[PDB]
């Protein structure tokens, strides 16, 4: 169920990702340099953008906020209810839960089973050496090429049109990194330590954790800024197994790349079905048109 | 079945190939120095780059990922399941099978029979000295010099400072005495366009290095020890392990960065017999070298066929204009 | 057939010919000191370089690779198939063919009749004392003098550290008591503009050194023990063995490094008889020396064929402007 979502969103009057500045009065939004051809030689321009760290943290908080509803939310770390980006301490050798139980940091098959954040977003254990790769990968929300090449100035400082290419490889959740696949008698099966129903519940929870993503709940300083949020266009791919990653919206000729990859990916013989919003993606391909966000995730959780 | 692919790919706002920083708050990207003509005497310029050892590492992980799906995927070591690039340690006198069986480290014929990953990637047991050359070789990923000669500065590094917040059950930041596991976690990003020249040699897979070819009656034939079905399955797996190569699965720290990726331009040649290595996409004028090195190869009489994307390469050469990388994989698997 | 090729090439991000740091984690590339005028008295400088033993070894490798495809590829040593550098050791009084035939080390005429690798690259058995001077001579790959004197620094070593991360079956980093084979393994990398002058002498292939010329009635003739068709096959294989040199198949660590390879310029002289050696491209001023030597050799009456790539080489001298490296081999081999 390796899902990829990428699109263009118009962000107006946003002050997300404050640099801090050491607590001084003057705080400025961070700058990242991006290269654009402009047909007269590649040139790098500094623009305001959103880093992947706070995007991933917002994915954390959305997941934990919309995962408490299910009755399987008992197995949750107390650091998650406080919306903490830190997962484990520098010198912490044990983990405690909301009920108050104690969990050791050995036999990763148990860390994956009795922990929630560690299973879905990975974990790092400096002492015992336990480590799990995060199943969620967040890109950088960069300004689109057309707006930068046509603005010919207007430093803003922000506002404009940005793009996102969020990707979720949640097909391995609930399966420990130690033994991903087990062979009974010359037959591969997924070593799902938890009962299948909890694995499903994690699947629906992760799929519908996208609600506080396109609703204007991204970034920092939301208590005073609340930028005008409006989804312009998006495209999503679900598939079932390993598929090529969807391209980000920074480039201008992205429709052609998306349609080409979808069509020839179907040509290889993969169960490829694409969801579109404000993107034609041609007519010869089977692209499902969705005009909002709620029915998109509703259809995403249809076949879980 | 030798695959030669090279070209340009654009990677922006990326932190591939982090140096580590020695376990401190400041972690940066490894940098290398490269010579550029600049039309006024060759000069050395420093720039972040990508080492090819993790290119081999993740071609390995793609190999195992796309080959365990095959029915013949039982033939693995336990380490390949964990996606670990290490193959054999100094004290490893035996290898544990994926299904729980045990194998020794002698009679390389067997080591390539029941093991496929070490067969296609080489291995080493220091105690007994068993050796196999890796059937795949990795090129270094470097920024194309035609862009370094244009940036005239522009260090490519941002070093954005983002800190992790940690509080106790009372919502207190704390101080240094309590620890609180509060470290700055400062990491730098890079952007631009790089070149890739990953090269694959699938003609020698499944063949012992000691006795590549045997003679029954003064005639040569390859020392095929396994069933050709497993051979073909390994060929397909190796060729379609390129899918998580030109999709955005190169480098390091994919969980938080996930660099934006697109294929700027690519050229591939396959043939059947030994062929020269193709020129890198690092150089500005690589296209002329490519067209020459393929047209002359055709002239001498090598059954070489060329696939192209984003370059015309002229009109006198029969070049297949591919559309992307996975349909390119289909085109390569058309021959087997 | 005395062919001489020399020119300038660029090598970047390569760990070729690594000294290994005396067997430790820090592995470093071999360095050589060279003298440069600097118009103020000759001064020495330490720069990394690649020795010619490497060049001769992969010349042997390419010769084997391009000779096994020929129908006469049976006549090869069993160790040549596995790319063994050594030809004969201390205690081997006999040799084994690819098919397993036993061969004595007496009357070297039959040795070169039935071995082909030893005929072209020489051999020496200390127990029997039978000697053979290698018919190919290798020049050292040094960076060009002008480039070295133009940088006044920039040692061209990056010292990129790249370790091995392994955990136990539970996923633990471990400590020194358990070992875990965790090292640092820092390796330094080189870049620059080098020159090459690999030369081949094919006028004595298939002829024993004891009596190179036979007389029937006061008339000289070459003493070829083998059938002449095998002589053409060996000559063609040797000529085409340089294909995996100007493409990036030179040096060690070909799996992870794969040096970024291209030819900046080159000059070749083929001729038929003995000719003066082509001067090395290390010197910044080898071009006018080359044109003077070829012009004077033509004046003396030497039927030399001159080929050039990226070198004007004057206008009066009849030189064929080649297009690539492999078609240059085609030009060399039409006249056999």
């Amino acid at each position: 169920m390796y899902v990829r979502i990428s699109g263009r969103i118009r962000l107006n009057a946003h002050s997300l990702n404050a640099q801090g500045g050491g607590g001084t009065n003057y705080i400025e939004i961070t700058k990242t340099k991006v290269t654009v051809r402009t047909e007269n030689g590649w040139t790098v321009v500094e623009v305001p953008a959103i880093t992947g760290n706070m995007l991933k943290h917002w994915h954390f908080v959305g997941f934990v906020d919309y995962f408490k509803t299910t009755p399987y939310g008992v197995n949750l770390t107390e650091r998650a209810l406080r919306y903490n980006g830190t997962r484990f301490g520098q010198g912490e050798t044990t983990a405690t839960k909301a009920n108050g139980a104690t969990v050791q940091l050995n036999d990763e098959a148990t860390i994956i089973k009795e922990l929630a954040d560690a299973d879905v977003h990975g974990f790092l254990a400096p002492k015992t050496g336990r480590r799990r790769v995060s199943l969620v990968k967040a890109s950088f929300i960069l300004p689109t090429e057309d707006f930068i090449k046509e603005v010919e100035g207007e430093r803003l400082i922000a506002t404009g049109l940005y793009g996102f290419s969020i990707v979720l490889d949640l097909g391995l959740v609930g399966i420990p990194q130690g033994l991903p696949v087990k062979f009974e008698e010359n037959q591969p099966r997924p070593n799902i330590v938890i009962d299948p129903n909890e694995r499903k519940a994690r699947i629906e929870s992760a799929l519908k954790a996208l609600i506080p993503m396109l609703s204007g709940y991204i970034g920092a300083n939301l208590a005073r800024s609340f930028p005008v949020f409006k989804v312009e266009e998006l495209v999503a791919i679900a598939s079932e197994g390993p598929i090529p990653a969807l391209v980000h919206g920074f480039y201008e000729d992205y429709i052609e790349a998306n349609r080409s990859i979808i069509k020839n990916a179907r040509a290889l013989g993969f169960n490829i079905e694409v969801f579109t919003y404000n993107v034609d993606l041609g007519e010869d391909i089977e692209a499902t048109k969705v005009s909002s966000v709620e029915e998109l995730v509703a259809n995403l959780v249809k076949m879980v | 079945m030798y695959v030669r692919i090279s070209g340009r790919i654009r990677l922006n706002a990326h932190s591939l190939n982090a140096q580590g920083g020695g376990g401190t708050n400041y972690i940066e990207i490894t940098k290398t120095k490269v010579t550029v003509r600049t039309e006024n005497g060759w000069t050395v310029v420093e720039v972040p780059a990508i080492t090819g050892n993790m290119l081999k590492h993740w071609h390995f992980v793609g190999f195992v990922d796309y080959f365990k799906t095959t029915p013949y995927g039982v033939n693995l070591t336990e380490r390949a399941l964990r996606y670990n690039g290490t193959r054999f340690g100094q004290g490893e006198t035996t290898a544990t099978k994926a299904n729980g069986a045990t194998v020794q480290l002698n009679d390389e014929a067997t080591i390539i029979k029941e093991l496929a990953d070490a067969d296609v990637h080489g291995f080493l047991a220091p105690k007994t000295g068993r050796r196999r050359v890796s059937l795949v070789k990795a090129s270094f990923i470097l920024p194309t010099e035609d862009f370094i000669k244009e940036v005239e500065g522009e260090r490519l590094i941002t070093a954005i400072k983002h800190n992790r917040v940690d509080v106790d059950e009372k919502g207190a930041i704390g101080s240094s005495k309590e620890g609180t596991a509060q470290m700055l976690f400062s990491r730098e990003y890079a952007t631009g366009l790089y070149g890739f020249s990953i090269v694959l040699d699938l003609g020698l897979v499944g063949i012992p290095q000691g006795l590549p070819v045997k003679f029954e009656e003064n005639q040569p034939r390859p020392n095929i020890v396994i069933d050709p079905n497993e051979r073909k399955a390994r060929i397909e797996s190796a060729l379609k392990a390129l899918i998580p190569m030109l999709s955005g699965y190169i480098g390091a720290n994919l969980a938080r960065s996930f660099p934006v990726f697109k294929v700027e331009e690519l050229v591939a040649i396959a043939s059947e017999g030994p062929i020269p290595a193709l020129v890198h996409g690092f150089y500005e004028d690589y296209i002329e070298a490519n067209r020459s090195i393929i047209k002359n190869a055709r002239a001498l009489g090598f059954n070489i066929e060329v696939f192209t994307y984003n370059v015309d390469l002229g009109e006198d050469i029969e070049a297949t204009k591919v559309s992307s990388v996975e349909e390119l994989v289909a085109n390569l698997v058309k021959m087997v | 057939m005395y062919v001489r090729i020399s020119g300038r090439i660029r090598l970047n991000a390569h760990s070729l010919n690594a000294q290994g740091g005396g067997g430790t984690n820090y592995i470093e590339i071999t360095k050589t000191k060279v003298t440069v005028r600097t118009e103020n008295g000759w001064t020495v400088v330490e720069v990394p370089a690649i020795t010619g033993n490497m060049l001769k070894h992969w010349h042997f490798v390419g010769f084997v690779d391009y000779f096994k495809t020929t129908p006469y590829g049976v006549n090869l040593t069993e160790r040549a198939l596995r790319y063994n550098g050594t030809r004969f050791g201390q205690g081997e009084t006999t040799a084994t063919k690819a098919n397993g035939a036993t061969v004595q080390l007496n009357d070297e005429a039959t040795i070169i009749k039935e071995l082909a690798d030893a005929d072209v690259h020489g051999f020496l058995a200390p127990k029997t004392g039978r000697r053979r001077v290698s018919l190919v001579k290798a020049s050292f790959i040094l960076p060009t003098e002008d480039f070295i004197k133009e940088v006044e620094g920039e040692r061209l070593i990056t010292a990129i550290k790249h370790n091995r991360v392994d955990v136990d079956e539970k996923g633990a980093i471990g400590s020194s008591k358990e070992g875990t084979a965790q090292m640092l393994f820092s390796r330094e990398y080189a870049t620059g503009l080098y020159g090459f002058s690999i030369v081949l002498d094919l006028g004595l292939v298939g002829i024993p050194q004891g009596l190179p010329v036979k007389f029937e009635e006061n008339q000289p003739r070459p003493n070829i023990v083998i059938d002449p068709n095998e002589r053409k096959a060996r000559i063609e294989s040797a000529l085409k063995a340089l294909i995996p040199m100007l493409s990036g198949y030179i040096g060690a660590n070909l799996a992870r490094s794969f040096p970024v390879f291209k030819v900046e310029e080159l000059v070749a002289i083929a001729s038929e008889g003995p000719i003066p050696a082509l001067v090395h491209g290390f010197y910044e001023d080898y071009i006018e020396a080359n044109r003077s030597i070829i012009k004077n050799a033509r004046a003396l009456g030497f039927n030399i064929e001159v080929f050039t790539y990226n070198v004007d080489l004057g206008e009066d001298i009849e030189a064929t402007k080649v297009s690539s490296v492999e078609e240059l081999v085609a030009n060399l081999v039409k006249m056999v």
């Binding site: - | 020695g22 376990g23 401190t24 | 740091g21 430790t24 820090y26 020194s176 965790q182 640092l184 820092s186």
Partner: protein
């Protein structure tokens, strides 16, 4: 005196256990010809002190005695009074005098 401490520190850089080996810095210090090379080698050697301090408690070994600022501020004028390399070379090997001592770093 005035040399034992810096040599003990440099031995703490590379010794038995303490799996952080960097021979490049000490090699460059030994072969340094000018004052700038010696200064940059000293700076590179001193840059690794936080790593050694962090690794001190990672294996239970006693913490390494960090060289005092007095030593480096004294070297500042003890190197910057010479005119020829011949007189500094032995200084370098004096700096390397304790590179491979049989010190009881972790008794």
């Amino acid at each position: 005196g005035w040399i034992r401490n810096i040599g003990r520190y440099l031995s703490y850089l590379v010794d038995d256990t303490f799996e952080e080996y960097a021979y490049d810095v000490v090699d460059g210090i030994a072969k340094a010809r000018t004052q700038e090379e010696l200064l940059e080698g000293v700076y590179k050697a001193l840059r690794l002190a936080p790593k050694l301090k962090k690794k001190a408690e990672s294996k239970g070994c006693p913490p390494p005695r960090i060289p005092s600022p007095e030593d480096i501020e004294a070297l500042e004028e003890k190197v910057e009074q010479l005119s020829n390399p011949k007189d500094l070379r032995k200084l370098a090997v004096s700096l390397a005098l304790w590179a491979f001592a049989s010190w009881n770093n972790c008794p």
